[PDB]
Amino acid sequence: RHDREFVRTFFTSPTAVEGEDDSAKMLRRAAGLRGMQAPDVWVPDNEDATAPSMRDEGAENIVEVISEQGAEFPGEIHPRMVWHRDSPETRYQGFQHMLDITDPERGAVEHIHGFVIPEVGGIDDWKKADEFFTIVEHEHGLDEGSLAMSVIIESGEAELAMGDLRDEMGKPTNNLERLFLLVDGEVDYTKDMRAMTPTGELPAWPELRHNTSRGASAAGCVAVDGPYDDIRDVEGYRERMTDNQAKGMLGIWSLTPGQVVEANTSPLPPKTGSWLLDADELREELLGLTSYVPSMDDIVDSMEEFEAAKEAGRGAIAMTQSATIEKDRMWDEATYQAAMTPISLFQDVYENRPDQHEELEERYGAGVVERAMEVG
Template sequence: MSLDTTDRHYEREFVRTFFTSPTAVEGEDDSAKMLRSAAQLRGMQAPDVWVPDNEDATAPSMRAEGIGNIIDVVAEHGADFPGEIHPRVVWHREDPALRYQGFQQMLRIATDDSDAIEHLDGFVIPEVGDIDDWKKADEFLTIVEHEAGLETGSLSMSVIVESGEAELALGDLRAEMGKPANNLERLFLLVDGEVDYTKDMRAMTRTGGLPPWPELRHNTSRGASAAGLIAVDGPYDDIRDEAGYLARMRENREKGMTGIWSLTPGQVVAANTAPLPPEDGSWLLEVDGEEIDLTEADGNHVYDGDAVAIEKAGEDDYVLSTGSDTRELDADELREEVVNMAAYVPGMDDIVDSMEEFEAAKEAGRGAIAMTQSATLVIDGVEIEISRDRMWDEATYQAAQTPITLFQDVYEHRPDQHEALEEMYGEDVVERATAVGS
């Protein structure tokens, strides 16, 4: 009987990091050295999903050796690796020979005399096309499972969306998954590949760089949500631009896409930590569509910038300037304007406190409660006391639960990160966060 598409057949509900490693490096005494290094990563340096990459990251002349390296390294280190392991094999929607090579690569790994296959969670299929092409990959995986003596559906399949065809196929998934003629329930990750997507779309920019493709990321996230899968953004290849990487992840999370490709161990650490709730709460100002973080000093929250200016114009009068807009306001009017610009970013303990308070209120028969957040903001030396009330009902509670559910998923599946999480939040907050919402 086919699985319900709302029932995940894999354990992870969130994937933060998708880390690729070349399977064979030419000109090295040990061509598997990068695989061996990645296989021994632990804690925040270890990804949720590790991808020994026998496609783009490995030269075609080294791919046969790369498969052997995957077998050797996974057999030796796979049992102790804290994340999931999903090798990427070759594939192409328009090339039967490449598809057959991908099948042979999976078959060789799965039927080797070593126990490597016992430590693999699935395979990554690149360059897929329309939904029929996805079904071909699924059928090959079914054959691989049969030849290896595995139960059908035991190997997950993740695909990389690198073409307009694959993007359109996202809309077919919900209808196709669960049909008796396929085993597409094995799908796990939907990963964007913006570089090849740009080539497939014949897109051009003035600088030769990649377009941002927000539509692709939205469509992939929507397709994953509709089919009960996990969406992952593609690589951010400016590996020194940590601020840009963090901004990209923040934009993605607003689309429901938590995971991102990581190219370096440094990006893995950033991508593992960025989606988690912050350690402490903070305030920001929203000015002309930009969010500006405030600095905490002596219990106050200080703005240090030139997008907003306040000058005293009298004992109880002020001049507020934001961009080209200048207004004369009294103290109450100024406070109202600052309240409208200010927003609070809750920390982990804030979220846990609010959820616990709402749970207690709900148990007492109350359907909604008001939560108040107060602070003193300092702009150009002017202190402004602000207070914001937020009404919490069941919908608010459910929305707030998403970052906690992410934390709980990480805590359950990554025990190697427990120490780091306790250092970030404290043992008491971690204990409460693992219990709230359950």
């Protein structure tokens, strides 16, 4: 239903960073990208890319930058607003921001193709965002249905909601034919699913990607994968994109300008070639070969470190494990929430298993224990 039949790259940029020369600096730069460096879909991100205390200034920055530069951005612009299925205050905040951003007197809306809504739940929560899009349109004299809605699938409920989208979109009490991208959010989804891994890295969730690809094909939407947060792992990003393309998920989230270029080229067929034989800078194949398996103490450390960064006005940071090499991973509030699971489980167990207090004290030490019991 939308102009872009295929979307290779979905790139988010923080809308307002603190410390500050120009808080809009990341948007002004991403707005000047061109050719293979520029994304099919660019997402100024007022949600997890942006510290909370910074989001009001972020939405002004969005209006200001797209005002001045959006006219020749060559991809499509769809900013991410705040939303959450379980928070009416957050829904209202994302609606008020969209309403400000599309005021036609401000010159941004003419260059905005739609908005991206995170944390949606079942289909009746998607109809609530849809109704806000309709109200915004009517309040600002835009054509009905002209702002595309894209959603981030980052809960069990939203994953199930993709099952009946075709007939729910047909109901004439909604305008959900405006739906454009269905985008996985593996980080908050890991959180919602309560998953954990020995390294703390994201599970691969092949079934989620299968279901988001199916859902888009059945409903006329386009499926995009979520963030590959080991931002320096060029080879990993390529292998993930190839795995995605075999599920029919041909687009991927990009966190950096370097990911944009890789993800723009990856699904393009090759120049020539090429026969393969399948019988059977050192730093880079070394990081490819090492992993760390953090202790309960390590986990709390990563969280406090992130906590401090966010409180200082930074939404997203590259966090580092160093040895012997230097392993980098993009952290934000989602990453923080997801990392907490092994701790929430420990706490549940301590609270409810007084008979195990002694072995847990043997296993951790009474000091590590009392620290864990403090978090969140």
